[PDB]
Design a protein around this ligand. Structure first.
Ligand SMILES: [Br-]
Ligand SMILES: [Br-]
Ligand SMILES: [Br-]
Ligand SMILES: [Br-]
Ligand SMILES: [Br-]
Ligand SMILES: [Br-]
Ligand SMILES: [Br-]
Ligand SMILES: [Br-]
Ligand SMILES: [Br-]
Ligand SMILES: [Cl-]
Ligand SMILES: [Cl-]
Ligand SMILES: [Cl-]
Ligand SMILES: [Cl-]
Ligand SMILES: [Cl-]
Ligand SMILES: [Cl-]
Ligand SMILES: [Cl-]
Ligand SMILES: [Cl-]
Ligand SMILES: [Cl-]
Ligand SMILES: [Cl-]
Ligand SMILES: [Cl-]
Ligand SMILES: [Cl-]
Ligand SMILES: [Cl-]
Ligand SMILES: [Cl-]
Ligand SMILES: [Cl-]
Ligand SMILES: [Cl-]
Ligand SMILES: [Cl-]
Ligand SMILES: [Cl-]
Ligand SMILES: [Cl-]
Ligand code: NA
Ligand code: NA
Ligand code: NA
Ligand code: NA
Ligand code: NA
Ligand code: NA
Lengths: 129, 129, 129
């Protein structure tokens, strides 16, 4: 059964403008090299990191959206609890830590990432038996 | 003096439908046996656990409602910080952990639980000298 | 560059009425002596602690306001992660702990506190290179 669905679009130029700025959440998610590389809006790193950010948001949307009219239970640092990793061929998967890992124990997170020009996007479908 | 008041109603059938499903907060509050037993909407466990859930919500309401127009300070995992225990005769009391235990140090939590047919309910009155 | 700006006003009488009451966040920020002293609305402690509270709120406003249309990431216990200390001559500065310390690494927090009659106020300007 489907637990939740989420989609997110990210402006790659806006992302690049912010990703290496002090006073943002991004140090908690990304390395200083990643953040420096991603601060150029036409780089590989910007495109890829923006799509990773998109994927985190799509997961958060997918789970939160499953709890209509319920007080939120996602921790304030949720962005650093959801990691998008890739295998050697670039296939993505989501790794979790903290409370969300316990909430989504026994749930499969299907994710896909894409980018084009100034736009990155991701979709997440949460599925459980 | 009264610090806060809260009341919550819970649909026992809706509760039973959700309590043992993956992708919910319930594993953090309830044991797998409790969750399995409570997944039948006409069982003892469903009625009792639904009323416990109701009591957690009534406590949260009672305290949050005391802070009108203030940014919330309840942690995301607040549901697992409030436990409803009973003595050998079924009398309920509330046990706290985390920040809410510190906030409600020196406050007495008066609680009552009830159920009937497809409905559980609880009321909480927080009192302090 | 400016990361954020915040301003807060605090009613010193309302603050004094609440600061030493059970069932409030204040034990986490202030000592029992501070809280007892500050519970008289015409005392030095009330005026000073109200302005410290104002400063915490101004910092929170300054940073949160920098994230228009973004899900909040400040932890529920944010008030106890922001401390206003003073040097021997009463000049204030802000000390941080927890996630906000990481978010505001490399950001300078300029703060000022004031009080008059029944009103305390503070302003925070967050600046980053
Ligand atoms: Br949520
Ligand atoms: Br974070
Ligand atoms: Br990531
Ligand atoms: Br609250
Ligand atoms: Br929880
Ligand atoms: Br419980
Ligand atoms: Br925020
Ligand atoms: Br706090
Ligand atoms: Br302080
Ligand atoms: Cl959006
Ligand atoms: Cl964007
Ligand atoms: Cl940010
Ligand atoms: Cl970094
Ligand atoms: Cl591999
Ligand atoms: Cl993909
Ligand atoms: Cl309700
Ligand atoms: Cl319900
Ligand atoms: Cl849930
Ligand atoms: Cl369980
Ligand atoms: Cl007993
Ligand atoms: Cl009772
Ligand atoms: Cl305000
Ligand atoms: Cl006020
Ligand atoms: Cl409070
Ligand atoms: Cl105290
Ligand atoms: Cl939180
Ligand atoms: Cl000094
Ligand atoms: Cl000053
Ligand atoms: Na997939
Ligand atoms: Na996929
Ligand atoms: Na009672
Ligand atoms: Na009772
Ligand atoms: Na300054
Ligand atoms: Na100053």
């Amino acid at each position: 059964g489907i637990v939740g669905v989420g989609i997110d679009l990210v402006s790659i130029p806006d992302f690049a403008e912010q990703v290496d700025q002090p006073g943002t959440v991004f140090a908690e998610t990304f390395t200083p090299g990643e953040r420096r590389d991603a601060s150029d809006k036409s780089s590989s790193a910007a495109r890829h990191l923006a799509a990773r950010w998109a994927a985190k948001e799509a997961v958060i949307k997918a789970w939160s959206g499953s709890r209509f009219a319920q007080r939120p239970v996602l921790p304030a640092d949720i962005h650093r609890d959801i990691e998008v990793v890739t295998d050697m061929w670039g296939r993505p998967r989501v790794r979790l830590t903290g409370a969300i890992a316990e909430y989504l124990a026994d749930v499969t997170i299907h994710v896909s990432l894409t980018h084009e020009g100034d736009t990155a996007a991701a979709v997440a479908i949460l599925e459980a038996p």
